[PDB]
RNA sequence: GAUCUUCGGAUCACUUUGGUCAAAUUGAAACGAUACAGAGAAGAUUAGCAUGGCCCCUGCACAAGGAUGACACUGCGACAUUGAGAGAAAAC
């Protein structure tokens, strides 16, 4: 993950996108330091937020604007700058706007069911449109 | 929203919330100190191992320690009464 001055030089298309990744890292640090205003699980929601956003940025670089070479993209996934499993989920129908990967797997729930965010809002009542407790998600379903 | 399909629709996904319990006087324990006595076995100094359980503490322990860890170690009536006398009473 961490790169030294004497490490192998990343592929060519890296430097122009290096600064924004640096900004992502900076704010992740700030979120780590920032404390208060939530329950034991709510304070850990913004982490997944930024993480999904960062992975989506890389996904947008490759699959929507073809701004990065395939070599650089494999390098980025190998350096954990993006979550390979989350991107794999984004590449199949029904999970285009997946929030995180803990809201899809059923072994982490009380009754073996996915999260509320995975459910389309059309069949969900108006009153029970609440923030996810896993990551604060406000609706994953591809329809919305 | 993506995919087809023919502008009828079909696919793809589909219900969270670990809760000694709401931002700390008044529902997570157990005591400091001061004041009193103040160290087992029939004189005195003193080794210990035990018995009993709504007494525990240290210990990983079915070792061993904590004053021999401490407290306790007793005691009574399924007694049948007649054996006899005396004054009274009621009775040989
Ligand atoms: K002694
Ligand atoms: Mg002993
Ligand atoms: Mg003893
Ligand atoms: Zn979600
Ligand atoms: Zn999630
Ligand atoms: Zn969720």
UniProtKB/Swiss-Prot annotation:
Q: Carries keyword Lipoprotein?
A: no
Alphabetized UniProt keyword annotations: mRNA processing, mRNA splicing, Nucleus
What are the annotated GO cellular component locations? Answer: post-mRNA release spliceosomal complex; Prp19 complex; spliceosomal complex; U2-type spliceosomal complex
Query: Could you tell me where this protein is found in the cell?
Result: Nucleus
Record InterPro entries: BUD31
Single biological process term from Gene Ontology: mRNA splicing, via spliceosome
Tell me the subunit arrangement.
Belongs to the 40S cdc5-associated complex (or cwf complex), a spliceosome sub-complex reminiscent of a late-stage spliceosome composed of the U2, U5 and U6 snRNAs and at least brr2, cdc5, cwf2/prp3, cwf3/syf1, cwf4/syf3, cwf5/ecm2, spp42/cwf6, cwf7/spf27, cwf8, cwf9, cwf10, cwf11, cwf12, prp45/cwf13, cwf14, cwf15, cwf16, cwf17, cwf18, cwf19, cwf20, cwf21, cwf22, cwf23, cwf24, cwf25, cwf26, cyp7/cwf27, cwf28, cwf29/ist3, lea1, msl1, prp5/cwf1, prp10, prp12/sap130, prp17, prp22, sap61, sap62, sap114, sap145, slu7, smb1, smd1, smd3, smf1, smg1 and syf2.
Known role: Involved in mRNA splicing where it associates with cdc5 and the other cwf proteins as part of the spliceosome.
Q: Which family does it belong to?
A: Belongs to the BUD31 (G10) family.
Q: What is this protein called?
A: Pre-mRNA-splicing factor cwf14
Gene name of the encoded protein:
cwf14
